Ligand SMILES: Nc1ncnc2c1ncn2[C@@H]1O[C@H](COP(=O)(O)OP(=O)(O)OP(=O)(O)O)[C@@H](O)[C@H]1O
Ligand SMILES: [K+]
């Protein structure tokens with residue numbers, strides 16, 4: 001187990017959608033990397049200018065639509081690729 | 097359903113205007129993507145330096161003129177394209 | 193010995209854009225029965241734009257032949273994969289001819305098969321294309337060298353009208369080469 | 376430019392003079408007692424040869440009308456070489472005889488088009504009679520005899536070609552190339568022996584042989600070229616868990632991937648060797664697929680859809696034994712379904728039937744010989760390069776004749792088959808008397824090969840021809856022994872295809888040539 005610091009989060013990306021809505025198989029660039037991923041670990045919280053750590057709105061086990069970019073990083077925990085990023089990168093959580 | 101975090105908003109863009117004011121059909125670049133869209137979901141609010149979350153002026157169900165750019169992200173909820181962006185990107189709400 | 197070879201109906205000199213489209217290996221050719229005829233004036237590289245058309249064709253189950261300037265890259269690869277997977281028997285071939293001629297021949301194929309050509313000049317987009325937009329033929333033989341369409345499902349009167357238009361052009365046509373091509 | 380125009384007898388006489396020049400240069404080579412012709416080459420030493428098509432190709436005359444005749448009759452030898460690969464001299468001799476008799480007839484005032492129609496009718500009937508008279512040549516003894524006769528009575532060449540055909544088999548491909556030694560060498564390689572060596576010298580398992588030897592290895596067939604170890608990493612890990620060696624066929628393995636493979640090769644975790652895929656674009660994929668069917672594997676390609684990260688051991692091919700050297704890669708007893716191999720061979724055969732190019736057809740037949748049957752190389756042994764050229768031409772003639780014999784059968788050699796055919800066609804008649812005369816000139820020309828063979832032996836062509844005609848069946852005159860006997864029994868066999876093709880091409884060209892009344896050419 002790896003837990004993030006400050007406002008960072010450990011998220012495991014979902015497998016790219018092999019098939020489309022109408023059952024058409026997507027390959028190569030068509031099966032683009034998913035922007036949605038499950039949260040494996042949440043940081044303690046962000047540190048404000050005044051010196052208090054504000055908890056993050058993300059919780060462990062909730063699906064999050066992340067924004068791929070320099071902010072997100074690739075790391076391998078137990079031969080499993082996990083992304084590391086700030087809560088800012090997370091756009092919206094997917095509930096239900 | 098997908099609900100945003102912090103000051104972000106989930107907005108569904110309006111269909112481009114097929115015809116002009118004088119009934120002339122616009123095609124290709126003429127029918128540019130609309131900058132106006134309905135708000136599907138609103139974030140809890142923006143977090144200030146002091147640590148309080150200020151609610152967003154935008155509400156659910158109000159038409160908003162949004163500024164297309166890097167800030168907005170394209171995501172598909174139930175096979176429907178929705179834009180994700182900060183309240184800053186929202187310029188003016190279209191009431192009545 | 194002198195040999196006579198007579199090909200009937202449409203049979204343009206375009207082969208399959210991907211060898212794996214072959215339904216019948218012992219003949220090395222694709223034999224599509226009652227397939228839709230998609231006629232796109234533009235070239236194709238991404239699967240997104242034809243994706244509604246592919247989903248409709250799948251839901252129906254009939255095969256789909258894509259006559260377009262060129263189907264390659266991601267689009268070609270996904271079409272091939274779906275061809276083996278069996279969801280949709282899809283074959284893609286290059287449009288016959290070149291500049292101005294290619295358009296006209298696409299429109300003649302559309303008239304024969306009762307379809308519509310997807311072009312930017314005409315105005316329609318491929319994302320909005322429907323099954324009714326797609327043409328129809330009783331049979332389609334694809335091989336490496338040529339494409340043959342058998343019994344295109346199109347209104348007879350439209351075929352005679354298009355033939356009459358081409359005849360008028362032939363009459364006006366003065367150059368031997370051009371006249372032979374319209375003939 | 377300004378033209379010289381000649382009409383009637385003058386033009387025909389000049390045409391015949393040119394044809395006679397070319398045919399006299401060519402016919403001195405016909406038969407066992409036939410001599411050699413030296414062809415001056417601008418570059419290299421003069422070529423000494425006993426082949427009608429080469430002599431004919433070199434012939435070109437100063438006189439424009441004679442040169443027209445020479446070129447026209449040269450088409451006969453060229454076409455005979457293109458179709459059968461042998462019989463070019465017999466064909467030139469037949470064309471000269473037909474032209475001479477037909478021009479005599481034209482000088483008698485008969486209609487040349489009717490003469491041409493009579494010649495065509497006689498030749499069609501003659502082809503039918505040759506097919507009827509032909510006997511299959513399937514035994515190795517007859518094949519060796521055919522090769523020996525086509526190699527100017529070189530028993531060694533015939534026996535070598537018979538052995539090569541017996542080894543590689545019907546689907547086997549045989550090629551003739553220069554040899555370093557003085558003796559003819561036969562080299563036969565079975566299964567896949569595509570010409571690609573190890574991408575890294577350190578893959579060599581056996582140093583004293585300078586080659587990689589893999590025992591029961593997996594085979595990975597990737598259509599793409601790779602430079603990173605990440606994509607194959609699952610495949611390498613699966614192989615290491617299995618413990619058997621691995622062979623990589625791909626467009627190119629280089630950089631980090633190749634270096635990692637080499638390091639793992641010494642370290643012993645995986646016995647891995649990588650070589651380049653055979654052939655080039657639009658053909659590399661075909662050879663990859665044939666290897667996949669032979670070894671029971673699947674080709675990893677982006678077009679097919681599969682990725683290398685998802686490749687599994689079942690995806691990998693299987694073979695019993697592998698040899699990698701610097702020049703070629705050999706796979707022995709690939710573990711693949713037989714029915715699939717025959718099916719793939721049948722598809723390649725269908726493409727061969729569809730193929731219309733000599734290069735394309737020979738490449739597909741080479742692919743077939745790689746899948747099933749084998750490939751043989753005959754290294755011609757000669758002391759010098761001129762002898763090498765002459766012997767290679769003779770061996771190529773023998774190979775073409777043996778292939779023709781296997782394809783269509785054999786008939787009596789020594790021009791005996793044409794003599795018998797002409798005898799069987801004595802009752803053939805045309806629509807008019809001129810067509811009858813054309814038939815007769817064709818029949819008389821059918822005696823030209825035997826007469827020229829006898830003439831090249833210094834004997835009397837008419838006496839020998841009369842004696843042979845007085846005989847029946849396969850009875851003929853062995854020119855090598857100057858004796859009479861059963862041509863089949865003494866081993867003088869001519870492929871039916873060669874004789875038929877010579878007759879047909881000579882007849883077509885000569886019949887058209889005798890129809891000429893005007894000749895238009897540039898002025899001198
Ligand atoms: N010992 C022999 N006795 C009689 N005829 C023979 C003998 N050996 C060969 N021949 C005959 O010689 C004829 C032609 O042989 P040759 O190689 O001289 O000419 P070709 O095959 O017509 O020409 P090329 O090699 O230029 O294509 C054949 O009909 C063959 O049967
Ligand atoms: K010869």
Ligand SMILES: [Mg+2]
Nearest residue numbers: 461462525772
């Ligand atoms: Mg010969």
